[PDB]
Design a protein around this ligand. Structure first.
Ligand SMILES: OC[C@H]1O[C@H](O[C@H]2[C@H](O)[C@@H](O)[C@@H](O[C@H]3[C@H](O)[C@@H](O)[C@@H](O[C@H]4[C@H](O)[C@@H](O)[C@@H](O[C@H]5[C@H](O)[C@@H](O)[C@@H](O)O[C@@H]5CO)O[C@@H]4CO)O[C@@H]3CO)O[C@@H]2CO)[C@H](O)[C@@H](O)[C@@H]1O
Ligand SMILES: OC[C@H]1O[C@H](O[C@H]2[C@H](O)[C@@H](O)[C@@H](O[C@H]3[C@H](O)[C@@H](O)[C@@H](O[C@H]4[C@H](O)[C@@H](O)[C@@H](O[C@H]5[C@H](O)[C@@H](O)[C@@H](O)O[C@@H]5CO)O[C@@H]4CO)O[C@@H]3CO)O[C@@H]2CO)[C@H](O)[C@@H](O)[C@@H]1O
Lengths: 366, 366
């Protein structure tokens, strides 16, 4: 304790790393010792399992999932401001079981390195290298030499025509796994129906009726999104924006929508549309103009969002958003919405029980 | 042609959008017309299918996958500099079948909106709202009113206790789908073995032998990563770094490694380790010190990577990286490497045929 021991491979810049450690000690008094043991990536699980080893281990990320599965790595805790400083795909490489288990440093790939004076135009194909070697051999030279003891160096050739390690299956929505008629869905809709039966709400309330009632001070609360705030600003009501109420102790989970602008495939103006959206709308000034009319909520444009993030209404918007879920964009989403609309309206009006309404919606969607 | 027609929903800031369109026309002469038809999200697939409709359509992203499946949307083409200006998860929301099919604008979620003067401390639970309503009703008021005709507004309550739309299955490596002994793997290893048989290479060449031969000008080419460049700089050789050769017309596919720093779970210095890695190593000055010793390649730190990106050696590194694949971090990766090492060494030395070596590796991994 009171020290840092670092392990890094002997082909990396460990002397330069030790100079970073010297600056660390000069500022903090904490000694940093950089070592480069052989087989460090095999020794680490052996010594960390006994509670020994280095404080920090450097390796390519392919070793780290095995370490994390064995409980040998601490979860790292960079805040969002620090995570923003590194490329997102590098954080992905060090994420295991949903947790960040290392700090990414550098991105490595093999390349062809060539002597400009022996091969001014290096070969573009592997197949032409034997002919080049024959000409170099009469000069006492060879075309190419690389490490054949480590599979890292031969893998690019093995993969070229179709070799691979493990196949990756992309994330996907299971369009047959729908949760509209499970017990939790029924419990929430039953509560809504119970409020209607108890005359706390009326089944015929729509957007206009609820907005007028809230903005005239006739009801204490409403549920709406950022576009509604402008009309409340103009009203007499002093309003706050906060977390949706919990149900059975669990957060309400609103669907998160990304307002998006698509370009019609039939448009003869695709270049103009790109210019307008990229260079006029998606600017601080462009979004401010729309936002001043009806608030957008949080915006996708980082520079303008940092100016909105302070507003408690935006903070509440993002707190509810985090408790909820981003909507799928799959084609089946419209079928989902049409079916759920019918279920809620039928249950709220008494044309169906909650169970029969949601069962029918589930059948329609799947 | 020569116009922009925009469709946006009637609850959004369409007058503010039209002012952005006015500025567009003032600068370009191109008229922008903003309309807010009812049912625009249903009308669009009907009119875009006939080659009509608006140039740009605004909606939440949940509608857009259906449009893109129907071929109604143009692929949008923002460059990397523009994509960097928006939050990554917003681009994810508008990606369909691997392609970006809209521009994200805003991030929306419902919140509880409350009258500060009627309910200074708004309810944290749904279950307490009936009691609040009874007290407000004696004052001629009600606790809460919101739109019950659109399922968007009731969904947060339905999802709270377990309702969901479509279940998402996270991306994953299939540890039983291994490509070490397929036809492409065998073809590439066979070519390596054929070069060895033809005496273009020697099976016993290792890292040291290849590095010495290249850096003394005895071989025209080598295959190595960025850490090797420092020793070539000091040598007499004038070297370039370029794309790996193709095989059977296809790019060589090197495995991409992210050099990573993990913190030992047994370390009593986890706070010091975080301080060192975040505030000393992962700085421009910290990475420069390591990089000056042995080059890191591309770095994860955006600010320093932008200073390296100009170097043709780094450009070539990233070109090869893009043709290749990020390594998995799964625990099975070490088994993969050990098995492939044995296969390559055995095939190159003649202790096994290419087919028998790679079949054995495949069996060992699975
Ligand atoms: O005693 C018997 C045997 O020992 C010797 O070989 C062994 C090695 O000493 C030992 O390190 C071990 O090597 C394994 C390694 O543990 C395993 O992780 C995997 O290595 C991968 C890396 O994980 C991967 O990142 C990548 O490594 C790159 C690295 O990213 C890059 O930054 C730079 O450092 O180059 C590295 C490549 O050299 O690829 C490697 C795979 O090539 O697989 C390794 C095995 O190949 O186990 C070795 C075998 O026991 C002696 O060399 C051997 O002669 C003896 O027979
Ligand atoms: O004529 C019969 C019937 O017509 C009327 O209802 C129909 C609507 O006019 C019509 O627009 C259509 O509504 C569908 C919609 O097409 C479908 O996409 C889906 O809507 C989702 C959104 O996709 C989703 O983004 C979200 O919308 C939010 C939005 O994100 C937010 O920014 C803001 O605008 O609030 C929106 C919510 O209002 O959620 C909605 C779902 O609530 O589902 C819609 C159906 O609910 O089809 C309607 C039914 O035919 C009349 O209203 C009706 O009385 C008539 O019986």
């Amino acid at each position: 304790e009171g020290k840092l021991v670092i392990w890094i491979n002997g082909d990396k810049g460990y002397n330069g790393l030790a100079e970073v450690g010297k600056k660390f000690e000069q500022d903090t008094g904490i000694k940093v010792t950089v070592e480069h043991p052989d087989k460090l990536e095999e020794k680490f699980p052996q010594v960390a399992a006994t509670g020994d080893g280095p404080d920090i281990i450097f390796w390519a990320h392919d070793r780290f999932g095995g370490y994390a599965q064995s409980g040998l790595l601490a979860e790292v805790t960079p805040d969002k401001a620090f995570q923003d400083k590194l490329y997102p795909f590098t954080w992905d490489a060090v994420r295991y079981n949903g947790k960040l288990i290392a700090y990414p440093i550098a991105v490595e790939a093999l390349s062809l390195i060539y002597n400009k004076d022996l091969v001014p135009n290096p070969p573009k194909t592997w197949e032409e290298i034997p002919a080049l070697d024959k000409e170099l051999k009469v000069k006492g030279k060879s075309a190419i030499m690389f490490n054949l003891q480590e599979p890292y160096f031969t893998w690019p050739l093995i993969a070229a025509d179709g070799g691979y390690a493990f196949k990756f299956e992309n994330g996907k929505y299971d369009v047959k796994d729908v949760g509209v008629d499970n017990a939790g869905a029924k419990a929430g809709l039953t509560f809504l129906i119970d409020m209607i039966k108890n005359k706390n709400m009326s089944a015929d309330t729509d957007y206009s009726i609820a907005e007028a009632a809230f903005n005239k001070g006739e009801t204490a609360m409403t549920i709406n999104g950022p576009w509604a705030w402008s009309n409340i600003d103009k009203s007499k009501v002093n309003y706050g924006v906060t977390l949706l109420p919990t149900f059975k102790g669990k957060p309400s989970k609103p669907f998160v929508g990304v307002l998006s602008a698509g370009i019609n495939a039939a448009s003869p103006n695709k270049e103009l549309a790109k210019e307008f959206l990229e260079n006029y709308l998606l600017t601080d000034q462009g979004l401010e103009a729309v936002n001043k009319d009806k608030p957008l909520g949080a915006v996708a444009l980082k520079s303008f969002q940092e100016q909105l993030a302070k507003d408690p209404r935006i903070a509440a918007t993002m707190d509810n958003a985090q408790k909820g879920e981003i909507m799928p964009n799959i084609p089946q989403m419209s079928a989902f919405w049409y079916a759920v609309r019918t279920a809620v309206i039928n249950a709220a009006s008494g044309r169906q029980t909650v169970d029969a309404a949601l069962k029918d919606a589930q059948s329609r969607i799947t």
